[PDB]
Amino acid sequence: MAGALRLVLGDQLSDNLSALVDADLSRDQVLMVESRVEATAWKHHKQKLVLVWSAMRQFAERLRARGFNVRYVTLEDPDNTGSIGGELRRALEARAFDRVIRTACGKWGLESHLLSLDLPVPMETREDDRFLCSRAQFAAWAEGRRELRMEFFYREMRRKTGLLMDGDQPAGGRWNFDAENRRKLPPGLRPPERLRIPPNPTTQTVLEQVSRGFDDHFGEVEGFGWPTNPDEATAILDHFIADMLPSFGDWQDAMSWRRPFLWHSLISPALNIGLLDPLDICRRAEAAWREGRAPLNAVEGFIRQIIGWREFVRGIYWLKMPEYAQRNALDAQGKLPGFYWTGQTDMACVADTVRAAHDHAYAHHIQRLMVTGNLAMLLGVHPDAVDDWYMVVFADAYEWVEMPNTRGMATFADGGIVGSKPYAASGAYIDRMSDYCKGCRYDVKKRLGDDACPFNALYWDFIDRHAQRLAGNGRMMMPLRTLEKMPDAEREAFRKQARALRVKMGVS
Ligand SMILES: Cc1cc2nc3c(=O)[nH]c(=O)nc-3n(C[C@H](O)[C@H](O)[C@H](O)COP(=O)(O)OP(=O)(O)OC[C@H]3O[C@@H](n4cnc5c(N)ncnc54)[C@H](O)[C@@H]3O)c2cc1C
Ligand SMILES: Cc1nc2c(=O)[nH]c(=O)nc-2n(C[C@H](O)[C@H](O)[C@H](O)CO)c1C
Ligand code: SF4
């Protein structure tokens, strides 16, 4: 009875973490490591580093206040080996333990590494039951399904959680209340001001250290306003539930120039490191509808993103890795344009997405999908390069969620496992859902010439290039019919325009 060494990683900052269950506070030790391996696996946004390390230090203090013995290895510690495995070994050398207990993590490569570590004591790995669907449950649901579709997974998660269920039937008599025909904000409507969290003293200290120590990483650290502990994160959630959730269903796919948050919740960076709980979030939204403070379409749309999409992508990741990370179904080989890093492009929609990534480490979903994701797919950027960008620039990015949304939904590099069709779109889509195109120097009605919106020739070149395959996919009938009715000279024209754009943008 020497006790257990309990590992807590930077995205595991929850009192209810399975590795902390049944802790013997008089014998056990919690290990937390500020890891340069993890901090450089991708060159994470400076604000992601601030968030994780500020949240970790505060979580350690919360554990100590509850009686835990915490071995906390900081970035400045000259004996820190830099890695989780190295620090495990060193912790085990410092005092006697009977075993290591940890919670399976959110990156296949680290999980595979930790599972094969040869340590002097046994290492027990527990599932991360903060998620609503276990890895085993997803595998069992997916078995024998020719295609994995969120629509059907979501119904299963509604029945299992009981969220928005009146007995055995969905509230309102339908599962999903998504509406077609949603469009951009009306000219006069101004998105409301959003609550941000001024840095607390711990966060300020970490801000100063990241500013000095990681200046080469992407992004601005000034203005950091993300919540870094459960009190701050609940404040963000409270604001969303009371002030934004009633409007959540009107504007989920709209874009407004330099209004980067609209009515979104801004909870993903906190949720993905454990500062909020998925079930609790959804129950709070359900209560808003039950009690007459929000309409059902809004609340259902919100809950579907958390118990549906979030759990579905996690399921696909662990079911399909490691091969998933290698898939390149459209044989994309291009380089990522420099403007993905600098924002220096005349494409107003792209420039605004990069602006928000740089300044806030955030862009909302339809920008990630239909602006920068769609563009990378149409350009034929190699999926490794695309995954790298999405991992670096957003404060909510962890591989389990980034990769199926990026390699899958946004770029079809997975051949449709997540998304069932490429989300390709011309500039017409961005024009219908945003206020970007009028102020953009490009003409969204033109396909050819130096004034043409690049998305237009790129879209048709993409449909053309992959025409044989997309006609088999099944769900692209309208674009292929339009392509077919085009005379040959018109097709050759947009092929040449797209070739030019790929040279101009530094792709290929
Ligand atoms: C190419 C691309 C890459 C993405 N990379 C990430 C990533 O690294 N991390 C991440 O957490 N999300 C990722 N997303 C999903 C989604 O864009 C973000 O979760 C969302 O923008 C976060 O903003 P929010 O907290 O304001 O969410 P809201 O719009 O308020 O939505 C509520 C919550 O639903 C969840 N959610 C919504 N859509 C998804 C989805 N598609 N997948 C998973 N959870 C979702 C999040 O928990 C989010 O907080 C990606 C989407 C795309 C298309
Ligand atoms: C920047 C960063 N730093 C750390 C760290 O210092 N220590 C740690 O234990 N985890 C860190 N993380 C999170 C991991 O890199 C990784 O994304 C998660 O552990 C996946 O579950 C991140 C993202
Ligand atoms: S015209 Fe094209 S490039 Fe410019 S904002 Fe519209 S969609 Fe984006």
Author numbering: 1 to 508
Copy text verbatim from the article accompanying this structure deposition.
Photolyases repair UV damage to DNA by using absorbed blue light. Within the photolyase/cryptochrome superfamily (PCSf), a major subgroup consists of prokaryotic (6–4) photolyases. These enzymes rely on flavin adenine dinucleotide (FAD) as a catalytic cofactor, besides an ancillary antenna chromophore, and a [4Fe-4S] cluster with yet unknown function. For the prokaryotic 6–4 photolyase of Caulobacter crescentus, we investigated structural changes associated with its different redox states by damage-free crystallography using X-ray free-electron lasers.
